[PDB]
Ligand binder design. Structure first.
Ligand SMILES: Nc1ncnc2c1ncn2[C@@H]1O[C@H](COP(=O)(O)OP(=O)(O)OP(=O)(O)O)[C@@H](O)[C@H]1O
Ligand SMILES: C[S@@+](CC[C@H](N)C(=O)[O-])C[C@H]1O[C@@H](n2cnc3c(N)ncnc32)[C@H](O)[C@@H]1O
Ligand SMILES: [Mn+2]
Lengths: 591, 136, 279, 370
């Protein structure tokens, strides 16, 4: 029977048009809101939905984040194609009217050119297919493969009428750059409040704690418990456009709290996540008779709890829906670091998969099958850093490294991707990078399918100073960081030794740190040794065969082979080194 | 300077071969002082007297101090192996015979600081490699 | 009135900044060519240093280099500065304090660039450099080499690479070639030169900031050894002849010292610019 | 009569073809500027005009100046009264001086041989796959923003279906082999470096506007050059010289070669591109500017197309040549090279008519297809 599938619009271009996090969140919520408005008439008509599970929970504003994906598959009864057609421009007139409103800054408007620009730019495609199946399990891949090729049709505005004072045509830029409103003095004596727009009104309302969003430093420092936003808004409102001054005021007020300021309060973490190989999870939920609606339920529950947990840590969700996640979090917040948030989100994923997909795990993964997984990409940068390049770094970490799409892409560009080489693709990874104010990068990749991730989290939690308390934490030796870097070759020799590496590592650390001052750091040395051994074992088990097949694959040149060949022991040393540097960076203040 | 991994590997092999490290990865605890003192003595008194002192077998020493000279010899032989052979190379690459003692070898072939440099690097490699084992 | 080749003799250490995201122990790293990975000076740095030296000559600056930033009327510059490429480098020896190291690949690249740019006084230099390179390859026979051109310098040891230098008695170095390349010259294989010019063999200096006896900061800095020679190309867009003559006369006078680098107050990067002399 | 030249450009240094959100644009001036791989054809026109005035010693020097009538008329007869303008997109004449037509800029590889030069083109988006377009009554159908079109069944011509993860045709450029299309990765043609630049003096300034700018400079691999064909009115002459094409004073070398007369350069370019022809699609070899994309999508069903931004510097013979140039008030979106227009049965003629109705853009090597 009839099925209708919809792809939403040019999300990547609109995201690239943004410049800061407000514009990014506005751009993401624009597409979330567009999908919401498009699908609401069909949801209220109670159509049979296949790709998402649009229950009552998604429609409720959940901390101002976009849960509605860009793909939907209908079960069509004759008479909905044309009403979808009419609603497609009904939404366009509605958005044109919403933008053409004095609630937003600017100087007059015109709905007609806004509508024409939106229709030229926003690409609403819907496919109609009459296939013989009442089973969603073959329905969704069949519609998805056609949607993927349908996506590659370019509709754009030909003339873009710019400058000339105001004959604006870059209306999406207009919306995203002015999405919070105006300061709106309210009287002679007020606390300033932003006006708001359709996006931030469809988002969080007026139930307290709704002081919208502005700049980045209140995200990066949402623990100091003194009011960044109002303390900086008074400064700008005490004088005579939107973000740069209040951002400028915000760094001034934060700098004025020098007594408790810690270096990480100026560093911001961008967290991107994606579901690890959910198409093959669908296929395996295939051959084994299990409905896909369970996967939809699990992803829904994970999305809701992910928004809750991110806002609990002190982070601002940008888009959590389907299998995809993007968030803006502080480096530290109330004794929890970013890696604690990553671990909590991972555990939320496993918990939801357990709760809803219990049949699949109980029937398949025990025999032999990889469970569904989540890959994480984290980037920590100064607040005065290009947002576009930070998001590029996060995308690189997530795709090229965390998903090992560098391996796949280098192999496929030269057409080497045999099935045996596809067996060596790796998932379930944490890609983490940190750029200082200088340019020194600390980057590392770890596998979350093992005890190395657990021990890494425990080491971080153990040796990070907790200022919120003031009883004590196990002390840290900063000379171990330089020892790991300088003695890396000897450590590699120890790691490559078989069935004596544990005793050798213990002996090396004892014999290098042989002074009376090192009697207090035996716990740290032991934890480092355990983590290093675990990471070396994981790395050999993940990479030895992959490297020995890459080495004698006489289709790749030496440069790409070297960029593809990973040394297990050296990677373990680098991971431990980067973790120790992160601990030191969080701990060290410059009083 | 950095730590040469290959020289550390030669040190491991030579320490095992010359019977300083036992089968349960242990040494008699006087040898670390032996190596450190060898480096200091080479700096302070000269190569030949230090080699003669540590190579002497009629000593009232706690353990077999002359084994460190055997380890030195093995490391130097190993590094002289895999020396590149180009007509612009200052290195000899000739292997020290097992018949020869180190002191006579430096006496009859000792006109260049190549032996001094190699001995300094070998002593450093011994010092850093011995830290991977335990002292009885 | 055309393309000209200029030579930079460095009188102290040079640190021309990279700003690149360092991964290792050295915080400030010097500029290297993106392809050859040999040390280089950017066109922007050369232009800035030469403009700073000539800052008091307003008319010359306006005519030759252009308008100032933040200025109005924004006139363009007539002269175009090119990348400064490392020609010769000082390496340590035992008979002499240092030898000045030139590679065969850097020599061939110089010949190729002089052909491509068509330097004014280049036809003679190309012929003699090509003959020297061909003689060197005939004597080398494909083996790694280190050739001195002073009979007193035979038997010299390049300590970092541990290489003995030989004197080919039938490979003549002409006096202008010495005046260009350097005084105590070794022509060696580019592998040896790249080893001698990499990050592990460049002079690294430790620095710190002290507050009443307690050190506040610490970092490591990479520099380029003094007496190193760098060559760059200059094209004048048919500029005013008198201003150009003043420029050439000032640059080619012995008493002119130019500052290119990232530490002016501690003497980093004071250079002397030489123009290609007739052969 | 008319005189036809082939003009080869060789990069002397790292070049910068930039523009869109470039530096000094204001509104978060975005110090980080990335270089476009090719210059706009307007840059080619302007370079030709600048060199034409250089040969005849008719340039503007010194602060704001004047012009006597007779040199004004000779500039009229040599270059024209007005630069390449988008408003004259449907003018049947180029509106310039001796310049009549230029081919789109072409990437040329120069092997160390008397052997001819290999012409490299962007890889067609449909290369490697077949689009079947099964249309016999309603069996499947898609609406592109409210227009009826057939369904694009795409299979790898090697069944399976189009996996967008495998899709990497946008990273490749192609040239002619014996009977195999030679695929070259874009990185193997253009190498990029990021430059950090500052102003040393330090005065009162604000971010994106005081110092600390980053620019992407492109270098073209060893044996590759840029080229195009030009037709001149025959009363002028073009001489080999050293040129400035692009931003930050990117310097090139002109080699001007005279090709044999009575040679339509459009036919030459299309002969070069002949090896990429497919009977069921129109291959866009250079940016196109259909005035209604909905109109084009009416007659084309699957437009495997991309978009590039075009913005032009607008000057006349009497303009402040030392000052912020007047930019085109409108941003014009153009069809990327390598784009594929899949037409209905027949109907190729009037879509071709729509494409060729911009004769001014056709003459400035823009709406070229095969
Ligand atoms: N709500 C949902 N319910 C069921 N399946 C979903 C849902 N959202 C997304 N999916 C599935 O996730 C996939 C979306 O594409 P995506 O690139 O994220 O897949 P993937 O296999 O996880 O990718 P990767 O190769 O990066 O691991 C599709 O296979 C789609 O069926
Ligand atoms: C990975 S790229 C490829 C998809 C393609 N560009 C598109 O949008 O159809 C875009 C991805 O961004 C994610 N995304 C979807 N809707 C989003 C939104 N409203 N805001 C942010 N990201 C979104 C989805 O995972 C989608 O696949
Ligand atoms: Mn995804």
């Amino acid at each position: 029977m009839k099925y209708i599938a919809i792809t939403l619009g040019p999300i990547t271009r609109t995201i690239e048009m943004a410049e800061s996090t407000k514009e990014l969140w506005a751009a993401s919520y624009f597409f979330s809101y567009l999908a919401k408005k498009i699908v609401e008439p069909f949801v209220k008509k109670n159509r049979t939905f296949q790709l998402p599970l649009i229950n009552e929970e998604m429609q409720k504003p959940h901390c101002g984040a976009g849960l509605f994906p860009d793909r939907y598959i209908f079960k069509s009864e004759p008479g909905d194609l044309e009403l979808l057609k009419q609603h497609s421009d009904q939404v366009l007139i509605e958005i044109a009217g919403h933008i053409a409103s004095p609630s937003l800054p600017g100087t007059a408007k015109d709905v007609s050119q806004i509508y024409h620009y939106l229709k030229s730019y926003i690409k609403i495609y819907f496919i109609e297919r009459t296939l013989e199946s009442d089973d969603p399990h073959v329905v969704i891949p069949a519609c998805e493969k056609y949607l993927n090729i349908i996506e590659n049709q370019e509709t754009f505005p030909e003339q873009e009428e710019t400058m000339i004072s105001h004959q604006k045509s870059d209306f999406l830029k207009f919306l995203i750059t002015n999405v919070n409103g105006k300061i709106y003095r309210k009287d002679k004596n007020s606390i300033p409040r932003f006006t708001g727009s359709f996006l931030t009104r469809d988002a969080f309302g007026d139930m307290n704690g709704e002081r919208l969003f502005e700049s980045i430093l209140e995200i990066s420092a949402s623990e100091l418990n003194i009011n960044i936003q109002q303390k900086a808004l008074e400064v700008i409102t005490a004088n005579e456009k939107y973000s740069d001054q209040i951002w400028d005021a915000e760094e001034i007020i934060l700098n004025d709290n020098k007594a408790q300021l810690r270096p990480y309060h100026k560093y911001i973490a961008i967290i991107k996540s994606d579901g690890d190989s959910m198409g093959e999870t669908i296929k395996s939920m295939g051959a084994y008779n299990i409905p896909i609606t369970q996967l939809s339920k699990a992803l829904l529950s994970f999305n809701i709890e992910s928004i809750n947990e991110i806002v609990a840590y002190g982070g601002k969700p940008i888009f959590i829906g389907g299998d995809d996640l993007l968030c803006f979090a502080p480096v530290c917040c109330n004794g929890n670091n970013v890696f604690n948030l990553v671990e909590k989100l991972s555990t939320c994923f496993d918990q939801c998969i357990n709760q809803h997909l219990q049949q699949y795990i109980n029937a398949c993964s025990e025999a032999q099958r990889p469970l569904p997984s989540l890959s994480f990409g984290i980037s920590i940068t100064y607040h005065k850093y290009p947002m576009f390049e930070a998001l590029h770094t996060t995308d690189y970490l997530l795709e090229m490294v965390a998903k090992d799409n560098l391996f796949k892409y280098t192999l496929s560009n030269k057409n080497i991707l045999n099935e045996n080489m596809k067996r060596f693709i790796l998932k379930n990874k944490l890609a983490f990078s940190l750029q200082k104010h200088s340019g020194q990068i600390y980057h590392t990749a770890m596998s979350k399918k093992g005890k190395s991730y657990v021990k890494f989290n425990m080491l971080l939690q153990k040796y990070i100073l907790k200022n919120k308390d003031m009883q004590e934490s196990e002390k840290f030796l900063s000379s171990v960081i330089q020892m790991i870097r300088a003695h890396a070759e000897i450590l590699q020799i120890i790691l490559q030794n078989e069935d004596k590496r544990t005793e050798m590592l213990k002996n090396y650390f004892d014999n290098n740190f042989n002074e009376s001052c090192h009697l207090g750091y035996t716990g740290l040395f032991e934890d480092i040794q355990t983590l290093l051994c675990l990471r070396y074992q994981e790395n050999i088990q993940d990479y030895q065969n992959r490297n020995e097949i890459i080495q004698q694959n006489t289709i790749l040149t030496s440069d790409e082979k070297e960029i593809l060949i990973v040394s297990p022991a050296m990677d373990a040393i680098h991971t431990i080194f980067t973790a120790l540097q992160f601990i030191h960076f969080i701990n060290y203040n410059k009083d | 300077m950095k730590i040469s991994k290959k020289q550390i590997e030669y040190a491991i092999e030579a320490l095992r071969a010359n019977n300083i490290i036992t089968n349960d990865n242990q040494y008699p605890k006087v040898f670390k002082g032996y190596i450190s003192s060898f480096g200091a003595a080479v700096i302070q008194s000269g190569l030949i007297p230090a080699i003669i002192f540590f190579e002497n077998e009629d000593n009232d020493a706690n353990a077999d101090r002359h084994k460190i000279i055997g380890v030195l010899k093995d490391i130097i032989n190993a590094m002289r192996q895999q020396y590149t052979v180009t007509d612009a190379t200052i290195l000899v690459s000739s292997q020290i015979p097992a018949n020869y003692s180190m002191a006579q070898y430096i006496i009859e072939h000792g006109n260049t600081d190549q032996l001094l440099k190699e001995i300094t690097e070998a002593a450093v490699a011994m010092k850093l490699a011995l830290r991977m084992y335990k002292s009885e | 009135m055309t393309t000209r080749m200029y030579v930079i003799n460095t009188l102290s250490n040079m640190h021309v900044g990279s700003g690149e995201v360092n991964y290792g122990v050295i915080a400030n790293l010097i500029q290297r060519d993106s392809v050859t990975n040999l040390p280089n000076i950017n066109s922007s740095g050369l232009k800035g240093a030469i403009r700073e030296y000539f800052k008091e000559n307003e008319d010359l600056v306006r005519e030759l280099f252009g308008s100032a930033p933040r200025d109005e009327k924004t006139l363009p510059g007539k002269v175009r500065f090119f990348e400064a490429n490392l020609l010769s480098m000082p390496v340590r020896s035992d008979k002499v304090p240092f030898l000045m190291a030139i590679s065969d690949e850097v020599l061939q690249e110089l010949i190729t660039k002089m052909k491509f740019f068509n330097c004014e006084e280049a036809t003679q230099y190309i012929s003699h450099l090509s003959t020297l390179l061909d003689n060197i390859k005939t004597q080398a026979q494909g083996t790694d080499f280190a050739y001195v051109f002073d009979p007193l310098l035979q038997g010299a040891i390049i300590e970092e690479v541990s290489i003995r230098a030989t004197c080919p008695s039938h490979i003549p170095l002409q006096p202008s070639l010495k005046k260009l390349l350097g005084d105590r010259l070794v022509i060696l294989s580019h592998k040896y030169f790249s080893i001698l010019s990499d990050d592990n063999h460049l002079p690294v200096l430790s620095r710190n900031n002290l507050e009443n006896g307690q050190s506040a900061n610490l970092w490591y800095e990479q520099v380029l050894p003094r007496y190193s020679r760098l060559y760059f190309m200059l094209m004048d867009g048919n500029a005013q002849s008198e201003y150009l003559k003043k420029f050439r006369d000032t640059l080619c006078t012995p008493s002119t010292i130019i500052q290119i680098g990232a530490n002016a107050s501690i003497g980093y990067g004071y250079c002397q610019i030489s123009e290609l002399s007739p052969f | 009569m008319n005189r036809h030249y082939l003009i080869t450009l060789t990069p002397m240094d790292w070049f910068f073809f930039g523009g869109e959100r470039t530096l000094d644009d204001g509104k978060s001036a975005d110090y980080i500027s990335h270089s476009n791989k090719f210059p706009q054809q307007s840059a080619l026109l302007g370079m030709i005009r600048y060199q034409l005035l250089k040969q005849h010693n008719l340039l503007s020097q010194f602060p704001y100046t004047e012009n006597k009538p007779t040199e004004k008329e000779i500039m009229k007869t040599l270059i024209g009264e007005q630069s390449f303008r988008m408003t004259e997109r449907k003018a049947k004449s180029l509106g310039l001086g001796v310049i009549k037509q230029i081919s789109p800029l072409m990437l040329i590889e120069c092997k160390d041989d008397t052997s001819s030069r290999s012409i490299y083109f962007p890889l067609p988006l449909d290369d490697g796959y077949k689009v079947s377009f099964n249309e016999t009554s309603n069996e499947d159908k898609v609406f592109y923003n409210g227009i009826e079109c057939p369904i694009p069944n795409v299979y790898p011509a090697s069944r399976k279906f189009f996996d967008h993860k495998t899709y990497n045709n946008y990273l490749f450029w192609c040239t002619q082999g014996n009977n195999q299309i030679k695929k070259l990765l874009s990185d193997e043609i253009w190498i990029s470096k990021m430059q950090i630049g500052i102003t040393k003096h330090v005065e009162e300034g604000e971010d994106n506007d005081k110092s600390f700018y980053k620019q992407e400079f492109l270098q073209l691999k060893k044996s590759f050059i840029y080229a195009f064909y030009i037709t001149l009115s025959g009363e002028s002459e073009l001489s080999s010289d050293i040129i400035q094409l692009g931003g930050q004073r990117s310097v090139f070398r002109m080699e001007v070669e005279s090709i044999e007369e009575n040679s339509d350069i459009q036919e030459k370019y299309q002969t070069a591109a002949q090896f990429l022809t497919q009977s069921d699609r129109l291959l866009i070899l250079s940016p196109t500017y259909v005035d209604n994309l909905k109109e084009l999508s009416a007659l084309c069903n699957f437009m495997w197309s991309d978009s590039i931004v075009f913005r032009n510097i607008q000057t006349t013979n009497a303009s402040n040549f030392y000052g912020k140039p007047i930019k085109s008030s409108s941003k014009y979106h153009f069809l990327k090279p390598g784009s594929v227009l899949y037409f209905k049965q027949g109907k190729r003629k009037e879509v071709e008519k729509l494409l060729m109705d911009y004769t001014y853009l056709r003459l400035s090597g823009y709406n070229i297809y095969i």
